[PDB]
Design a protein around this ligand. Structure first.
Ligand code: SF4
Length: 207
C-alpha cells in the first residue's frame, strides 16, 4: 500500500515527520538527502501543497525555501495571508532529481502518478492532523493527487472545489505552481502573479 505501513497512528506532526524520515513507500528515499515534511501547526486553517521538495528544500529540511518559495511569500503578502498561520507541504516528500553537466542546481524530475499515490498516505495524515478549512493545490501534480489524474489546473482557475473522498470535506483551490511564474515575458509573469494572488484570496475567504 505504498507509505501506509510507515505512517504511525498519531496526529502529532513532529511524530509524523520523524516517521516520514523512515519511509520507504516508494524508491525516492534512496537518492534524496532527507524527507521534507510539512511546516506549520495544526491550528492552520489554510493548507498549501506543492509537488515535491526541490534542491534547496532537500537540504534545508523545510518546504518552499527557494526562489519559488520567495515568489509565493510575495504573493501571500499581497493577499494579506500570514505564512506562520499556514500549513505548507508537498504531494511527495522526497526530492526526485538529476544533474546535468554544467548545471548550477539539481534538476527536479516529475513524480510519477505511482509515486504520488504511494506517498498520499502522508498527505492524508497531514490533513487529518491539521483539519484545514481550505487546501491550496499549487501546480498539476498536487492538484491531481486530490482531484484525480485527469484534472487540469488551467481549466478551473479561481474555482472553489470540493471532492468527496477528501478528509474533512475542505474547500480546494487549484492554482499555478510558484515555480512557473519565475520565467517568461514580464507581462505574462505579472498577469500570472495577479492570478495567484486572486486564487490565494479566494482560498482565504472560504468559510
Ligand atoms: S516520496 Fe513519500 S512514499 Fe516515497 S519514500 Fe519518500 S515519503 Fe515514502
Amino acid at each position: 500500500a505504498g507509505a501506509q505501513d510507515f505512517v504511525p497512528h498519531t496526529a502529532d506532526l513532529a511524530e509524523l515527520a520523524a516517521a516520514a524520515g523512515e519511509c520507504r513507500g516508494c524508491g525516492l528515499y534512496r537518492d534524496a538527502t532527507q524527507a521534507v515534511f510539512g511546516a506549520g501547526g495544526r491550528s492552520a486553517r489554510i493548507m498549501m501543497i506543492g509537488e515535491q521538495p526541490g534542491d534547496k528544500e532537500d537540504l534545508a529540511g523545510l518546504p518552499f525555501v527557494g526562489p519559488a518559495g520567495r515568489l509565493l511569500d510575495r504573493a501571500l503578502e499581497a493577499a494579506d495571508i500570514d505564512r506562520d498561520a499556514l500549513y505548507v507541504t508537498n504531494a511527495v516528500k522526497h526530492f526526485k532529481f538529476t544533474r546535468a553537466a554544467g548545471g548550477k542546481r539539481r534538476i527536479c524530475k516529475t513524480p510519477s502518478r505511482t509515486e504520488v499515490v504511494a506517498c498520499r498516505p502522508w498527505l492524508i495524515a497531514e490533513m487529518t492532523s491539521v483539519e484545514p478549512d481550505v487546501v491550496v493545490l499549487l501546480g498539476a501534480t498536487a492538484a491531481k493527487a486530490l482531484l484525480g489524474n485527469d484534472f487540469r489546473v488551467t481549466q478551473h482557475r479561481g474555482e472553489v472545489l470540493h471532492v468527496d473522498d477528501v478528509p474533512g470535506d475542505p474547500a480546494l483551490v487549484a492554482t499555478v505552481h510558484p515555480s512557473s511564474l519565475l520565467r517568461g515575458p514580464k507581462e505574462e509573469r505579472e498577469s500570472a502573479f495577479a492570478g495567484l494572488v486572486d486564487d490565494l484570496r479566494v482560498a482565504a475567504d472560504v468559510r
